[PDB]
Design a protein around this ligand. Structure first.
Ligand SMILES: [Ca+2]
Lengths: 184, 40, 48, 48, 98, 48, 62
């Protein structure tokens, strides 16, 4: 499998990553990549094609996709630092996700907050606070039994400008080990 | 529906299966989803 | 002493007003369905 | 001075509607309409 | 009408009321971030329009200031009945262009 | 009744049920110092 | 707008389903309380459930 990636800047500038290649895995089906991106990136349009040499390339199957920045009117953002790791977190282990409130207004952001859905319902909630080092506490809490089929973590803060204010948010799917509380 | 993130603040919550009430300038009443097919 | 009064109040039924499909007439952004002949008219027949 | 059992009311924005710098609310069909639809601060005309 | 001197005291001070938008480097004004690169001088000394990766204009035509509108911008000594000097920035347009 | 938060509130109740009746071989799944008018409780019968 | 809130809830409440409904507030330096409630519609005069949550510096307004 091989990939093409036309990033677009904050301004007119269109910039292409070098074309990349990998194989779909044998036990997982996944072909996985990681793209570096411009610090100004507004969007990416990317294409993927099957690079299998047996294909006459005009019948070689391909797909095109588009990916977008989180579109803060106030240009205030919230990023979950998670690499989308495929292996599930083991029951009762501490979660180890860092978070960054990237914002023009961070002196107003004392804290950020988070929620965990499992199946349909919120099963945990909490708050995370600013260090003197100007980073913020990580999402540490143990992967309790209420999460185990799978779970979703959502994160937010609200910040003021001078006179606007904006909800600022991110979310990540967390894969959790298929192990029960009855332990049967 | 889907693995995470969103187009905007309201759409993060909406894609995450939440909804919300806020005075901080958003409302996911703006939004709908299709019959979902985003396999994770 | 003003001749009418209105009090803010809780509903007790759904609103039953329809949207207009208007049989291929051209629905302007403020909701007027102008005549289909006027699509790409020139001038401005919607106001909108 | 007085310690109130009364809350200060919060103040509330626009949801599906666009919001100007003042806090007034305006339709999204009036963003980049090129008139000044926001009465004073024309945030509907910013960086289009 | 005055005399003033420097000091050596060490009492705490909370003078850092946050400029949330952008500090106007010369004037010490703050301006909201939608006004940077609006094609207009919101800082007084043109600071806000530095390093604009693009500029966006708003006013489609030339537009006069209303006459004397910068004169009204100044406060009065109510007792001499005189304008004394400048208090509100009647060259500030916040987007505007209506 | 429409817009309560504009007014003062005693948001802490001052009208209550007495504590719910017990049951043979079961208990009130909820517990507290008082139950305000129109607050629910649910029962669960004990093991077996 | 110095003072703000979010309530969050599932996109759909399930009937008989002990829904866990979260509030946060901001721009506050004083504690207060709130009766988050599920009520009759359209008529807003009956309550299917309520909870008098306390919002305080202890819980960082959550
Ligand atoms: Ca400017």
């Amino acid at each position: 499998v091989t990939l093409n990636a036309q990033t677009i800047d904050v301004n007119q500038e269109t910039s292409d990553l070098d074309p990349s290649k990998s194989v779909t895995r044998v036990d997982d089906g996944v072909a996985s990549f990681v793209l570096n991106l411009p610090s100004g990136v507004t969007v990416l349009e990317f294409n993927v094609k099957t690079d299998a040499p047996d294909l006459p390339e005009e019948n070689q199957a391909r797909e095109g996709y588009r990916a977008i920045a989180y579109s803060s009117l106030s240009q205030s953002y919230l990023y979950i630092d998670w690499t989308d790791n495929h292996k599930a977190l083991l029951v009762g282990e501490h979660l180890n996700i860092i978070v960054t409130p990237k914002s023009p207004y961070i002196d107003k952001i004392t804290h950020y907050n988070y929620l965990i859905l499992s199946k349909g319902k919120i099963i945990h909630f909490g708050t995370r606070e600013k260090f003197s080092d100007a980073s913020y506490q990580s999402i540490n809490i143990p992967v309790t039994q209420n999460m185990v089929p799978s779970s979703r973590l959502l994160v937010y803060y609200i910040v003021t400008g001078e006179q606007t204010a904006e909800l600022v948010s991110d979310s990540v799917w967390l894969n959790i080990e298929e192990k029960c509380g009855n332990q049967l | 529906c889907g693995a995470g993130g969103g187009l905007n603040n309201a759409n993060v919550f909406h894609l995450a299966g939440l909804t919300f009430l806020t005075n901080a300038n958003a409302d996911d009443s703006q939004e709908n989803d299709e019959p979902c097919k985003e396999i994770l | 002493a003003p001749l009418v009064a209105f009090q803010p109040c809780i509903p007790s039924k759904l609103c039953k007003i329809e949207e207009a499909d208007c049989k291929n007439k051209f629905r302007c952004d403020s909701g007027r369905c102008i005549a289909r002949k006027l699509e790409c008219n020139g001038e401005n027949d919607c106001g909108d | 001075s007085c310690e109130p059992t009364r809350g200060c009311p919060t103040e509330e924005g626009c949801g599906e509607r666009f919001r100007c710098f003042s806090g007034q609310c305006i339709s999204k069909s009036l963003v980049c309409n090129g008139d000044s639809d926001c009465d004073e601060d024309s945030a509907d005309e910013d960086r289009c | 009408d005055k005399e003033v001197e420097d000091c050596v005291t060490n009492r705490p001070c909370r003078s850092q009321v946050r400029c949330e938008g952008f500090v106007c480097a010369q004037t010490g004004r703050c301006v909201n971030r939608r006004l940077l690169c609006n094609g207009d001088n919101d800082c007084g000394d043109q600071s806000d329009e530095a390093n604009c990766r693009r500029i966006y204009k708003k006013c489609q035509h030339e537009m006069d200031q209303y006459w004397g509108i910068g004169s009204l911008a100044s406060g009065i000594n109510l007792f001499t009945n005189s304008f004394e000097g400048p208090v509100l920035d009647h060259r500030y347009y916040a987007g505007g262009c209506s | 009744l429409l817009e309560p938060h504009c007014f003062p509130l005693s948001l802490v109740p001052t009208e209550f049920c007495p504590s719910p009746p017990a049951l043979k071989d079961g208990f009130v799944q909820d517990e507290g110092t008082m139950f305000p008018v129109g607050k629910n409780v649910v029962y669960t019968c004990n093991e077996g | 707008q110095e003072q703000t809130y979010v309530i969050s809830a599932p996109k759909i409440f399930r009937v008989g389903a002990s829904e866990n409904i979260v509030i946060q507030v901001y721009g506050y330096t004083e504690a207060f309380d709130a009766t988050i409630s599920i009520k009759s519609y359209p008529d807003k005069k009956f309550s299917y459930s309520s909870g008098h949550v306390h919002l305080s510096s202890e819980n960082k307004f959550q």
